[model samples]
Target: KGSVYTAQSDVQVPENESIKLTCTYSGFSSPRVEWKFVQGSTTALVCYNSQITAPYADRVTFSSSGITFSSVTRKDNGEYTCMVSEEGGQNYGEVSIHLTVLVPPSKPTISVPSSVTIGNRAVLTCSEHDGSPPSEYSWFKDGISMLTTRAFMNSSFTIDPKSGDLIFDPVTAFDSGEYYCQAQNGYGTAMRSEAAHMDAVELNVGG
Candidate 1:
Protein backbone atom coordinates (compact mmCIF):
# COMPACT_ATOMS: atom_id res chain seq x y z
CA LYS A 1 0.00 0.00 0.00
CA GLY A 2 1.32 3.53 -0.93
CA SER A 3 0.34 7.04 0.24
CA VAL A 4 0.73 10.71 -0.76
CA TYR A 5 0.29 13.78 1.43
CA THR A 6 0.74 17.55 1.44
CA ALA A 7 2.46 19.60 4.15
CA GLN A 8 -0.21 22.31 4.16
CA SER A 9 -3.88 21.63 3.47
CA ASP A 10 -4.87 25.29 3.09
CA VAL A 11 -2.84 28.19 1.72
CA GLN A 12 -3.90 31.86 1.50
CA VAL A 13 -1.86 34.75 0.16
CA PRO A 14 -2.50 38.20 -1.25
CA GLU A 15 -2.90 38.57 -4.98
CA ASN A 16 0.35 38.62 -7.01
CA GLU A 17 2.31 36.86 -4.28
CA SER A 18 4.58 33.88 -4.83
CA ILE A 19 4.08 30.67 -2.86
CA LYS A 20 4.94 26.97 -2.86
CA LEU A 21 2.81 23.92 -2.11
CA THR A 22 4.56 20.75 -1.02
CA CYS A 23 3.61 17.17 -1.71
CA THR A 24 5.52 13.94 -1.07
CA TYR A 25 4.92 10.28 -1.61
CA SER A 26 6.38 7.00 -0.43
CA GLY A 27 6.23 3.22 -1.14
CA PHE A 28 5.80 3.82 -4.89
CA SER A 29 8.46 2.90 -7.39
CA SER A 30 8.92 5.39 -10.25
CA PRO A 31 6.13 7.67 -9.09
CA ARG A 32 4.14 9.89 -11.47
CA VAL A 33 3.05 13.23 -10.02
CA GLU A 34 0.27 15.51 -11.25
CA TRP A 35 -1.45 18.61 -9.93
CA LYS A 36 -5.06 19.40 -10.78
CA PHE A 37 -6.84 22.69 -10.03
CA VAL A 38 -10.58 23.01 -9.52
CA GLN A 39 -12.35 26.35 -9.20
CA GLY A 40 -16.11 26.33 -9.08
CA SER A 41 -17.15 24.22 -12.11
CA THR A 42 -13.88 24.73 -13.97
CA THR A 43 -11.13 22.14 -13.73
CA ALA A 44 -7.65 22.32 -15.29
CA LEU A 45 -4.35 20.55 -15.01
CA VAL A 46 -1.48 22.41 -13.44
CA CYS A 47 1.04 19.60 -13.80
CA TYR A 48 0.72 16.38 -15.76
CA ASN A 49 3.05 13.43 -15.50
CA SER A 50 5.43 15.55 -13.44
CA GLN A 51 5.39 18.32 -16.05
CA ILE A 52 3.80 21.73 -16.23
CA THR A 53 0.85 22.03 -18.65
CA ALA A 54 0.33 24.58 -21.45
CA PRO A 55 -2.30 26.64 -19.64
CA TYR A 56 -0.04 27.14 -16.62
CA ALA A 57 3.29 26.43 -18.23
CA ASP A 58 4.73 29.88 -17.64
CA ARG A 59 3.69 30.77 -14.10
CA VAL A 60 3.78 27.30 -12.57
CA THR A 61 6.65 24.85 -12.08
CA PHE A 62 6.55 21.18 -11.21
CA SER A 63 9.29 20.10 -8.88
CA SER A 64 10.15 16.66 -7.54
CA SER A 65 7.89 17.06 -4.54
CA GLY A 66 5.26 19.61 -5.67
CA ILE A 67 4.50 22.79 -7.58
CA THR A 68 5.47 26.45 -7.15
CA PHE A 69 3.54 29.48 -8.30
CA SER A 70 5.74 32.37 -9.44
CA SER A 71 2.90 34.73 -8.47
CA VAL A 72 -0.73 33.93 -7.98
CA THR A 73 -3.76 35.86 -9.23
CA ARG A 74 -7.44 35.83 -8.33
CA LYS A 75 -7.98 33.30 -11.09
CA ASP A 76 -5.70 30.87 -9.22
CA ASN A 77 -8.00 30.75 -6.23
CA GLY A 78 -9.25 27.18 -5.98
CA GLU A 79 -8.65 23.69 -4.67
CA TYR A 80 -5.48 21.93 -5.81
CA THR A 81 -5.15 18.19 -5.70
CA CYS A 82 -1.72 16.56 -5.83
CA MET A 83 -1.86 13.11 -7.28
CA VAL A 84 0.77 10.39 -7.38
CA SER A 85 0.72 7.01 -9.01
CA GLU A 86 3.26 4.33 -9.87
CA GLU A 87 4.54 4.53 -13.44
CA GLY A 88 3.72 0.92 -14.26
CA GLY A 89 1.93 -0.25 -11.16
CA GLN A 90 -1.42 -0.03 -9.40
CA ASN A 91 -0.18 2.08 -6.44
CA TYR A 92 -1.96 5.48 -6.39
CA GLY A 93 -2.78 8.31 -3.96
CA GLU A 94 -3.73 12.00 -3.86
CA VAL A 95 -4.02 14.98 -1.49
CA SER A 96 -6.09 18.18 -1.72
CA ILE A 97 -5.03 21.75 -0.90
CA HIS A 98 -6.94 25.04 -0.90
CA LEU A 99 -5.45 28.19 -2.41
CA THR A 100 -7.03 31.57 -1.73
CA VAL A 101 -6.02 34.87 -3.32
CA LEU A 102 -7.03 37.95 -1.39
CA VAL A 103 -8.21 41.05 -3.22
CA PRO A 104 -9.18 44.56 -2.01
CA PRO A 105 -12.33 46.45 -2.72
CA SER A 106 -12.89 48.56 -5.83
CA LYS A 107 -14.62 51.92 -6.15
CA PRO A 108 -18.22 51.39 -5.06
CA THR A 109 -21.35 52.98 -6.53
CA ILE A 110 -23.68 54.88 -4.17
CA SER A 111 -27.16 56.15 -4.84
CA VAL A 112 -29.23 58.66 -2.85
CA PRO A 113 -32.38 60.69 -3.30
CA SER A 114 -32.22 64.37 -4.17
CA SER A 115 -35.12 65.20 -1.85
CA VAL A 116 -37.61 63.52 0.47
CA THR A 117 -40.55 64.94 2.38
CA ILE A 118 -40.65 64.80 6.15
CA GLY A 119 -42.22 61.65 7.74
CA ASN A 120 -41.27 59.59 4.67
CA ARG A 121 -39.06 56.54 4.25
CA ALA A 122 -35.95 56.24 2.07
CA VAL A 123 -33.36 53.63 1.26
CA LEU A 124 -29.91 54.70 0.11
CA THR A 125 -27.74 52.01 -1.43
CA CYS A 126 -24.06 51.31 -2.07
CA SER A 127 -22.58 48.42 -4.02
CA GLU A 128 -19.32 46.93 -5.26
CA HIS A 129 -18.64 43.61 -7.01
CA ASP A 130 -14.86 43.41 -7.26
CA GLY A 131 -13.39 42.37 -3.96
CA SER A 132 -12.21 38.98 -2.76
CA PRO A 133 -13.87 37.89 0.49
CA PRO A 134 -16.53 40.51 -0.31
CA SER A 135 -16.74 43.99 1.18
CA GLU A 136 -18.38 45.43 4.29
CA TYR A 137 -19.66 48.94 3.97
CA SER A 138 -19.55 52.24 5.91
CA TRP A 139 -21.82 55.24 5.60
CA PHE A 140 -21.21 58.94 6.08
CA LYS A 141 -23.33 62.06 6.13
CA ASP A 142 -22.15 65.59 5.30
CA GLY A 143 -18.55 64.23 5.38
CA ILE A 144 -19.11 62.95 8.93
CA SER A 145 -18.91 59.34 10.05
CA MET A 146 -21.93 57.09 10.53
CA LEU A 147 -19.89 53.91 11.01
CA THR A 148 -21.97 50.76 11.00
CA THR A 149 -23.57 49.14 14.02
CA ARG A 150 -22.73 52.18 16.12
CA ALA A 151 -25.33 53.07 18.71
CA PHE A 152 -24.93 56.77 17.91
CA MET A 153 -26.59 56.26 14.52
CA ASN A 154 -30.09 57.68 14.23
CA SER A 155 -32.50 55.21 15.85
CA SER A 156 -35.05 55.94 13.14
CA PHE A 157 -32.63 54.52 10.56
CA THR A 158 -31.45 50.98 9.90
CA ILE A 159 -28.14 50.27 8.23
CA ASP A 160 -26.71 47.01 6.97
CA PRO A 161 -23.01 46.67 6.14
CA LYS A 162 -23.51 43.38 4.38
CA SER A 163 -25.70 44.85 1.63
CA GLY A 164 -24.51 48.45 1.88
CA ASP A 165 -27.94 49.82 2.58
CA LEU A 166 -28.93 52.82 4.69
CA ILE A 167 -32.61 52.88 5.45
CA PHE A 168 -34.37 55.85 6.93
CA ASP A 169 -37.92 55.67 8.31
CA PRO A 170 -39.76 58.85 9.29
CA VAL A 171 -37.00 60.95 7.78
CA THR A 172 -36.72 64.44 9.26
CA ALA A 173 -34.90 67.68 8.47
CA PHE A 174 -31.84 66.27 10.28
CA ASP A 175 -31.57 63.64 7.51
CA SER A 176 -30.57 66.28 4.95
CA GLY A 177 -26.88 65.96 4.22
CA GLU A 178 -24.19 65.03 1.71
CA TYR A 179 -23.97 61.25 1.76
CA TYR A 180 -21.25 58.79 0.65
CA CYS A 181 -20.09 55.25 1.33
CA GLN A 182 -16.98 53.07 1.69
CA ALA A 183 -16.13 49.44 1.07
CA GLN A 184 -13.41 47.38 2.75
CA ASN A 185 -12.32 43.72 2.94
CA GLY A 186 -9.23 43.80 5.23
CA TYR A 187 -6.95 42.83 2.29
CA GLY A 188 -5.88 46.15 0.72
CA THR A 189 -6.92 49.76 0.34
CA ALA A 190 -10.56 50.60 1.15
CA MET A 191 -12.65 52.14 -1.62
CA ARG A 192 -14.97 55.16 -1.46
CA SER A 193 -17.99 56.25 -3.44
CA GLU A 194 -19.08 59.58 -4.87
CA ALA A 195 -20.84 62.00 -2.57
CA ALA A 196 -24.57 62.68 -3.09
CA HIS A 197 -26.89 65.31 -1.70
CA MET A 198 -30.24 64.59 -0.10
CA ASP A 199 -32.66 67.12 1.35
CA ALA A 200 -35.40 66.20 3.77
CA VAL A 201 -37.88 69.08 3.84
CA GLU A 202 -41.46 70.04 4.75
CA LEU A 203 -44.48 69.88 2.43
CA ASN A 204 -45.71 72.98 0.63
CA VAL A 205 -49.51 73.02 0.98
CA GLY A 206 -50.37 76.21 -1.00
CA GLY A 207 -51.57 74.37 -4.13
Candidate 2:
Protein backbone atom coordinates (compact mmCIF):
# COMPACT_ATOMS: atom_id res chain seq x y z
CA LYS A 1 0.00 0.00 0.00
CA GLY A 2 2.87 2.38 0.95
CA SER A 3 0.16 4.83 2.04
CA VAL A 4 1.31 5.94 5.47
CA TYR A 5 0.57 9.52 6.62
CA THR A 6 1.42 11.13 9.93
CA ALA A 7 -0.16 14.38 11.12
CA GLN A 8 1.61 17.10 13.06
CA SER A 9 2.59 16.62 16.66
CA ASP A 10 2.36 19.34 19.39
CA VAL A 11 3.73 22.88 18.86
CA GLN A 12 4.14 25.65 21.43
CA VAL A 13 4.88 29.36 21.08
CA PRO A 14 4.24 32.73 22.67
CA GLU A 15 2.24 35.57 21.13
CA ASN A 16 3.70 37.28 18.07
CA GLU A 17 5.94 34.48 16.88
CA SER A 18 6.42 32.24 13.84
CA ILE A 19 5.91 28.47 13.42
CA LYS A 20 6.42 25.88 10.67
CA LEU A 21 4.58 22.53 10.47
CA THR A 22 4.96 19.65 8.06
CA CYS A 23 3.22 16.39 7.21
CA THR A 24 5.31 13.42 6.03
CA TYR A 25 3.90 10.56 3.99
CA SER A 26 5.11 7.11 3.06
CA GLY A 27 3.19 6.00 0.00
CA PHE A 28 3.81 4.79 -3.54
CA SER A 29 2.39 7.57 -5.71
CA SER A 30 2.18 11.22 -4.49
CA PRO A 31 -1.34 12.32 -3.56
CA ARG A 32 -3.08 15.65 -3.35
CA VAL A 33 -1.91 17.50 -0.25
CA GLU A 34 -3.90 20.08 1.72
CA TRP A 35 -3.86 21.87 5.09
CA LYS A 36 -6.77 22.51 7.40
CA PHE A 37 -7.17 24.11 10.81
CA VAL A 38 -10.01 23.17 13.15
CA GLN A 39 -10.88 25.46 15.99
CA GLY A 40 -13.32 24.04 18.58
CA SER A 41 -14.78 21.55 16.11
CA THR A 42 -14.97 24.12 13.27
CA THR A 43 -12.84 23.01 10.35
CA ALA A 44 -11.28 25.62 8.10
CA LEU A 45 -9.08 24.42 5.23
CA VAL A 46 -6.68 27.35 5.23
CA CYS A 47 -3.96 26.29 2.83
CA TYR A 48 -3.34 24.16 -0.22
CA ASN A 49 -0.49 23.51 -2.70
CA SER A 50 1.81 26.06 -0.97
CA GLN A 51 -0.97 28.65 -0.88
CA ILE A 52 -2.89 29.81 2.16
CA THR A 53 -6.66 29.37 2.31
CA ALA A 54 -9.02 32.29 1.79
CA PRO A 55 -9.58 34.84 4.58
CA TYR A 56 -6.35 33.90 6.38
CA ALA A 57 -3.67 36.22 7.66
CA ASP A 58 -1.37 37.44 4.90
CA ARG A 59 1.66 36.20 6.80
CA VAL A 60 0.21 32.70 7.06
CA THR A 61 1.09 30.31 4.21
CA PHE A 62 0.97 26.59 3.35
CA SER A 63 2.95 24.50 0.89
CA SER A 64 2.99 20.82 -0.06
CA SER A 65 5.07 18.95 -2.64
CA GLY A 66 2.53 16.15 -2.71
CA ILE A 67 3.34 15.70 1.00
CA THR A 68 4.46 17.61 4.14
CA PHE A 69 3.45 20.99 5.57
CA SER A 70 5.90 23.76 4.70
CA SER A 71 4.43 26.29 7.19
CA VAL A 72 3.18 26.20 10.78
CA THR A 73 2.30 28.62 13.62
CA ARG A 74 1.29 29.16 17.26
CA LYS A 75 -2.30 29.50 16.11
CA ASP A 76 -1.88 26.05 14.55
CA ASN A 77 -0.84 24.70 17.91
CA GLY A 78 -3.58 22.15 18.27
CA GLU A 79 -4.92 18.86 16.96
CA TYR A 80 -4.28 18.80 13.19
CA THR A 81 -4.93 16.17 10.55
CA CYS A 82 -3.22 15.62 7.20
CA MET A 83 -5.55 13.89 4.83
CA VAL A 84 -4.08 12.07 1.82
CA SER A 85 -6.54 12.08 -1.08
CA GLU A 86 -4.79 10.17 -3.82
CA GLU A 87 -5.98 9.65 -7.38
CA GLY A 88 -6.90 5.98 -7.30
CA GLY A 89 -9.17 4.60 -4.59
CA GLN A 90 -6.84 1.99 -3.06
CA ASN A 91 -7.09 3.36 0.46
CA TYR A 92 -6.79 6.63 2.40
CA GLY A 93 -4.34 7.48 5.18
CA GLU A 94 -4.36 10.05 8.01
CA VAL A 95 -2.07 11.28 10.77
CA SER A 96 -2.38 13.60 13.76
CA ILE A 97 0.00 15.73 15.78
CA HIS A 98 -0.44 17.89 18.91
CA LEU A 99 0.66 21.49 19.35
CA THR A 100 1.37 23.25 22.61
CA VAL A 101 1.85 26.95 23.30
CA LEU A 102 3.96 27.74 26.33
CA VAL A 103 2.57 31.20 26.62
CA PRO A 104 4.80 33.68 28.40
CA PRO A 105 3.62 35.72 31.36
CA SER A 106 0.66 37.87 30.46
CA LYS A 107 0.38 41.57 31.29
CA PRO A 108 0.34 41.79 35.07
CA THR A 109 -2.54 43.48 36.90
CA ILE A 110 -2.53 45.79 39.93
CA SER A 111 -4.97 45.39 42.84
CA VAL A 112 -5.07 48.44 45.09
CA PRO A 113 -7.59 50.31 47.22
CA SER A 114 -9.48 53.14 45.56
CA SER A 115 -8.56 55.67 48.22
CA VAL A 116 -5.90 55.73 50.95
CA THR A 117 -4.96 58.49 53.40
CA ILE A 118 -1.33 59.51 53.92
CA GLY A 119 0.47 58.31 57.06
CA ASN A 120 -1.61 55.14 56.61
CA ARG A 121 -0.99 51.77 55.04
CA ALA A 122 -1.63 51.14 51.33
CA VAL A 123 -1.83 47.86 49.48
CA LEU A 124 -0.84 47.21 45.86
CA THR A 125 -0.64 43.71 44.48
CA CYS A 126 0.71 42.56 41.13
CA SER A 127 -0.86 39.49 39.65
CA GLU A 128 -0.79 37.74 36.27
CA HIS A 129 -2.66 34.91 34.59
CA ASP A 130 -1.52 31.31 34.28
CA GLY A 131 1.68 30.82 32.29
CA SER A 132 3.78 27.88 31.20
CA PRO A 133 6.97 26.85 33.08
CA PRO A 134 5.70 29.08 35.90
CA SER A 135 6.70 32.76 36.27
CA GLU A 136 8.66 34.84 38.77
CA TYR A 137 7.58 38.21 40.24
CA SER A 138 9.39 41.44 41.00
CA TRP A 139 7.86 44.62 42.39
CA PHE A 140 8.95 48.22 41.89
CA LYS A 141 7.69 51.50 43.36
CA ASP A 142 8.51 55.07 42.37
CA GLY A 143 11.37 53.96 40.14
CA ILE A 144 12.88 52.10 43.09
CA SER A 145 13.13 48.33 43.32
CA MET A 146 12.17 46.27 46.34
CA LEU A 147 13.69 42.96 47.46
CA THR A 148 11.38 39.96 47.76
CA THR A 149 11.99 36.21 48.19
CA ARG A 150 8.77 34.31 47.62
CA ALA A 151 9.19 31.22 45.45
CA PHE A 152 6.89 31.97 42.55
CA MET A 153 6.43 35.18 44.55
CA ASN A 154 2.66 34.53 44.60
CA SER A 155 2.08 38.26 45.06
CA SER A 156 4.29 41.33 44.75
CA PHE A 157 2.70 44.00 46.89
CA THR A 158 3.44 46.65 49.54
CA ILE A 159 3.52 44.24 52.44
CA ASP A 160 6.35 41.79 53.22
CA PRO A 161 3.87 39.04 52.22
CA LYS A 162 4.98 36.97 55.20
CA SER A 163 2.25 38.71 57.25
CA GLY A 164 -0.39 38.05 54.55
CA ASP A 165 -1.87 41.60 54.57
CA LEU A 166 -0.49 44.43 52.44
CA ILE A 167 0.55 47.28 54.78
CA PHE A 168 2.33 50.34 53.46
CA ASP A 169 3.59 50.93 56.99
CA PRO A 170 2.91 54.68 57.11
CA VAL A 171 2.49 55.58 53.48
CA THR A 172 4.33 58.72 52.52
CA ALA A 173 4.32 61.16 49.59
CA PHE A 174 7.35 59.32 48.18
CA ASP A 175 5.22 56.18 47.95
CA SER A 176 3.25 57.68 45.07
CA GLY A 177 3.87 57.21 41.42
CA GLU A 178 4.04 54.37 38.87
CA TYR A 179 4.47 50.87 40.28
CA TYR A 180 5.35 47.82 38.16
CA CYS A 181 6.19 44.15 38.40
CA GLN A 182 8.40 41.90 36.27
CA ALA A 183 8.06 38.25 35.28
CA GLN A 184 11.11 36.36 34.10
CA ASN A 185 12.11 32.89 32.92
CA GLY A 186 15.20 30.99 31.79
CA TYR A 187 14.45 31.95 28.19
CA GLY A 188 15.47 35.61 28.13
CA THR A 189 14.99 39.06 29.69
CA ALA A 190 12.21 39.73 32.15
CA MET A 191 8.78 40.78 30.96
CA ARG A 192 7.47 43.95 32.61
CA SER A 193 4.01 43.79 34.08
CA GLU A 194 1.32 46.37 33.48
CA ALA A 195 1.78 49.76 35.09
CA ALA A 196 -0.01 50.58 38.34
CA HIS A 197 -0.59 54.27 39.02
CA MET A 198 -0.91 55.26 42.69
CA ASP A 199 -1.48 58.63 44.40
CA ALA A 200 -1.25 58.96 48.18
CA VAL A 201 -3.08 61.83 49.89
CA GLU A 202 -1.53 63.99 52.60
CA LEU A 203 -3.20 64.00 56.05
CA ASN A 204 -3.09 66.72 58.69
CA VAL A 205 -0.95 65.83 61.74
CA GLY A 206 -3.33 67.90 63.96
CA GLY A 207 -5.31 65.46 66.08
Candidate 3:
Protein backbone atom coordinates (compact mmCIF):
# COMPACT_ATOMS: atom_id res chain seq x y z
CA LYS A 1 0.00 0.00 0.00
CA GLY A 2 2.42 2.65 -1.19
CA SER A 3 0.77 6.04 -1.73
CA VAL A 4 2.34 9.39 -2.46
CA TYR A 5 0.74 12.85 -2.58
CA THR A 6 1.88 16.30 -3.57
CA ALA A 7 0.81 19.58 -2.02
CA GLN A 8 0.87 21.13 -5.49
CA SER A 9 1.61 19.78 -8.91
CA ASP A 10 2.71 23.07 -10.44
CA VAL A 11 4.90 25.80 -8.98
CA GLN A 12 5.67 29.24 -10.48
CA VAL A 13 8.44 31.55 -9.34
CA PRO A 14 10.00 34.64 -10.88
CA GLU A 15 13.72 34.81 -11.35
CA ASN A 16 15.54 35.32 -8.04
CA GLU A 17 12.41 34.31 -6.06
CA SER A 18 12.20 31.47 -3.57
CA ILE A 19 9.89 28.42 -3.75
CA LYS A 20 9.17 25.15 -1.95
CA LEU A 21 7.97 21.95 -3.57
CA THR A 22 6.14 19.65 -1.19
CA CYS A 23 5.48 15.92 -1.20
CA THR A 24 3.93 13.42 1.22
CA TYR A 25 4.38 9.69 1.39
CA SER A 26 2.82 6.91 3.45
CA GLY A 27 2.64 3.11 3.80
CA PHE A 28 6.42 2.58 3.94
CA SER A 29 8.16 1.88 7.27
CA SER A 30 11.63 2.96 6.10
CA PRO A 31 11.39 5.44 3.23
CA ARG A 32 14.17 6.47 0.88
CA VAL A 33 13.57 9.80 -0.77
CA GLU A 34 14.92 11.31 -4.00
CA TRP A 35 14.35 14.33 -6.24
CA LYS A 36 15.04 14.56 -9.97
CA PHE A 37 14.87 17.49 -12.40
CA VAL A 38 14.12 16.93 -16.08
CA GLN A 39 13.70 19.16 -19.12
CA GLY A 40 14.16 18.16 -22.71
CA SER A 41 17.32 16.03 -22.91
CA THR A 42 18.69 17.32 -19.61
CA THR A 43 18.29 15.28 -16.45
CA ALA A 44 19.81 16.29 -13.12
CA LEU A 45 19.74 14.83 -9.63
CA VAL A 46 18.43 17.31 -7.11
CA CYS A 47 18.36 15.32 -3.90
CA TYR A 48 19.27 11.73 -2.91
CA ASN A 49 19.17 9.84 0.37
CA SER A 50 17.40 12.81 2.02
CA GLN A 51 20.31 15.09 1.06
CA ILE A 52 20.75 17.72 -1.64
CA THR A 53 23.21 16.78 -4.36
CA ALA A 54 26.56 18.54 -4.58
CA PRO A 55 25.76 20.44 -7.77
CA TYR A 56 22.63 21.92 -6.18
CA ALA A 57 23.74 21.87 -2.52
CA ASP A 58 24.63 25.55 -2.62
CA ARG A 59 21.12 26.74 -3.62
CA VAL A 60 18.79 23.94 -2.59
CA THR A 61 17.50 22.79 0.80
CA PHE A 62 16.30 19.23 1.42
CA SER A 63 13.46 18.35 3.77
CA SER A 64 11.12 15.50 4.58
CA SER A 65 8.46 16.88 2.27
CA GLY A 66 10.64 17.58 -0.75
CA ILE A 67 13.01 20.41 -1.60
CA THR A 68 13.30 24.21 -1.61
CA PHE A 69 15.11 26.72 -3.78
CA SER A 70 16.51 29.84 -2.15
CA SER A 71 16.22 31.54 -5.52
CA VAL A 72 15.22 30.15 -8.85
CA THR A 73 16.89 31.11 -12.12
CA ARG A 74 15.78 30.88 -15.74
CA LYS A 75 17.82 27.72 -16.20
CA ASP A 76 15.95 26.13 -13.24
CA ASN A 77 12.69 25.80 -15.10
CA GLY A 78 11.75 22.13 -15.46
CA GLU A 79 9.80 19.20 -14.06
CA TYR A 80 10.81 17.84 -10.64
CA THR A 81 9.70 14.57 -9.12
CA CYS A 82 9.79 13.30 -5.54
CA MET A 83 10.47 9.56 -5.58
CA VAL A 84 10.00 7.40 -2.54
CA SER A 85 10.73 3.74 -2.01
CA GLU A 86 10.92 1.22 0.85
CA GLU A 87 14.48 0.79 2.11
CA GLY A 88 14.19 -3.00 1.91
CA GLY A 89 10.70 -3.79 0.65
CA GLN A 90 9.54 -3.24 -2.95
CA ASN A 91 6.88 -0.55 -2.28
CA TYR A 92 7.40 2.57 -4.41
CA GLY A 93 5.66 5.94 -4.80
CA GLU A 94 6.36 9.23 -6.54
CA VAL A 95 4.96 12.72 -7.28
CA SER A 96 5.90 15.25 -9.94
CA ILE A 97 5.77 19.07 -10.10
CA HIS A 98 6.59 21.55 -12.87
CA LEU A 99 8.58 24.62 -11.92
CA THR A 100 8.18 27.74 -14.09
CA VAL A 101 10.59 30.59 -13.77
CA LEU A 102 9.14 33.84 -15.07
CA VAL A 103 11.36 36.18 -17.03
CA PRO A 104 10.52 38.65 -19.81
CA PRO A 105 12.41 38.78 -23.08
CA SER A 106 15.21 41.22 -23.65
CA LYS A 107 15.67 43.38 -26.72
CA PRO A 108 16.08 41.31 -29.87
CA THR A 109 19.03 42.08 -32.15
CA ILE A 110 18.62 42.04 -35.93
CA SER A 111 20.95 42.04 -38.92
CA VAL A 112 19.93 42.82 -42.49
CA PRO A 113 21.84 43.04 -45.72
CA SER A 114 22.34 46.58 -47.04
CA SER A 115 21.85 45.60 -50.69
CA VAL A 116 20.91 42.56 -52.72
CA THR A 117 20.78 42.14 -56.50
CA ILE A 118 17.44 41.13 -58.01
CA GLY A 119 16.83 37.37 -58.17
CA ASN A 120 19.37 36.73 -55.37
CA ARG A 121 18.79 35.28 -51.95
CA ALA A 122 18.51 37.63 -48.99
CA VAL A 123 18.53 36.40 -45.43
CA LEU A 124 17.79 38.46 -42.33
CA THR A 125 18.37 37.47 -38.72
CA CYS A 126 16.60 38.46 -35.49
CA SER A 127 17.14 36.81 -32.16
CA GLU A 128 16.85 37.19 -28.39
CA HIS A 129 18.41 34.97 -25.72
CA ASP A 130 17.51 36.40 -22.30
CA GLY A 131 13.90 35.29 -22.04
CA SER A 132 12.92 32.51 -19.64
CA PRO A 133 10.72 30.98 -22.27
CA PRO A 134 12.18 31.62 -25.71
CA SER A 135 10.70 34.54 -27.62
CA GLU A 136 8.50 34.18 -30.69
CA TYR A 137 9.73 36.54 -33.37
CA SER A 138 7.74 38.53 -35.92
CA TRP A 139 9.02 40.92 -38.56
CA PHE A 140 7.89 44.44 -39.39
CA LYS A 141 8.35 46.18 -42.72
CA ASP A 142 7.55 49.89 -42.65
CA GLY A 143 5.62 49.29 -39.39
CA ILE A 144 3.44 46.42 -40.72
CA SER A 145 3.55 43.00 -39.10
CA MET A 146 4.54 40.42 -41.70
CA LEU A 147 2.10 37.83 -40.32
CA THR A 148 -0.86 39.97 -41.30
CA THR A 149 -2.79 38.77 -44.35
CA ARG A 150 -2.02 41.86 -46.45
CA ALA A 151 1.52 42.41 -45.14
CA PHE A 152 3.45 41.10 -48.11
CA MET A 153 2.12 43.17 -51.00
CA ASN A 154 4.91 42.76 -53.51
CA SER A 155 7.21 39.84 -52.58
CA SER A 156 7.09 36.21 -51.48
CA PHE A 157 9.27 35.50 -48.44
CA THR A 158 9.27 32.89 -45.68
CA ILE A 159 9.47 33.74 -41.99
CA ASP A 160 10.58 31.20 -39.42
CA PRO A 161 9.46 32.40 -35.99
CA LYS A 162 11.30 29.75 -34.01
CA SER A 163 14.67 30.54 -35.56
CA GLY A 164 14.04 34.27 -36.10
CA ASP A 165 14.93 34.01 -39.77
CA LEU A 166 13.34 35.98 -42.61
CA ILE A 167 14.34 34.71 -46.01
CA PHE A 168 13.76 36.10 -49.48
CA ASP A 169 14.60 33.38 -51.93
CA PRO A 170 14.51 35.80 -54.87
CA VAL A 171 15.05 39.45 -54.09
CA THR A 172 13.19 42.02 -56.18
CA ALA A 173 12.76 45.78 -56.51
CA PHE A 174 9.83 45.71 -54.09
CA ASP A 175 11.99 44.32 -51.30
CA SER A 176 13.44 47.73 -50.44
CA GLY A 177 12.18 48.91 -47.05
CA GLU A 178 12.89 49.66 -43.39
CA TYR A 179 12.90 46.40 -41.44
CA TYR A 180 12.71 45.55 -37.74
CA CYS A 181 11.65 42.66 -35.54
CA GLN A 182 9.51 42.26 -32.42
CA ALA A 183 10.19 39.65 -29.75
CA GLN A 184 7.59 38.56 -27.20
CA ASN A 185 7.30 35.74 -24.67
CA GLY A 186 3.90 36.69 -23.13
CA TYR A 187 5.58 37.70 -19.86
CA GLY A 188 5.74 41.51 -19.93
CA THR A 189 6.38 44.02 -22.72
CA ALA A 190 7.33 43.00 -26.22
CA MET A 191 10.82 44.04 -27.30
CA ARG A 192 11.57 45.90 -30.54
CA SER A 193 14.85 46.03 -32.38
CA GLU A 194 16.43 48.91 -34.25
CA ALA A 195 15.47 49.30 -37.87
CA ALA A 196 17.71 48.33 -40.79
CA HIS A 197 17.33 49.26 -44.44
CA MET A 198 17.69 46.99 -47.45
CA ASP A 199 17.95 47.95 -51.08
CA ALA A 200 16.76 45.71 -53.90
CA VAL A 201 18.42 46.64 -57.20
CA GLU A 202 18.52 45.08 -60.64
CA LEU A 203 21.69 43.52 -62.02
CA ASN A 204 23.86 46.21 -63.64
CA VAL A 205 27.26 44.67 -64.41
CA GLY A 206 29.03 47.06 -66.81
CA GLY A 207 32.70 46.77 -67.87
Compare the candidates by lDDT and give the number of the best one: 3
Error of 2 at 7 (Å): 9.5
Give the CA lDDT, 0 to 100, for residue 42 in model 2: 83
lDDT (CA) for every model shown?
Answer: 0.87, 0.57, 0.88
Pairs clashing in candidate 3? none
Per-residue lDDT over 52-127 for candidate 2, one digit per residue giving the tens place of the 0 to 100 score: 6666646655555222233443455556566666756465676665655566666656675645567776766665
Name the lDDT of candidate 2: 0.57
Error of 1 at 31 (Å): 2.0
TM-score of each: 0.79, 0.48, 0.88
Worst 10 residues of 2 by lDDT: 155-164
Listed per model in order, the count of residue pairs whose N, CA or C atoms clash below 3 Å is 0, 17, 0
Task: Quote the positional error of residue 58 for candidate 3 in Å.
Answer: 2.9
Tell me how candidate 1 scores on lDDT.
0.87
Highest TM-score scorer = 3
How good is model 2 by TM-score?
A: 0.48
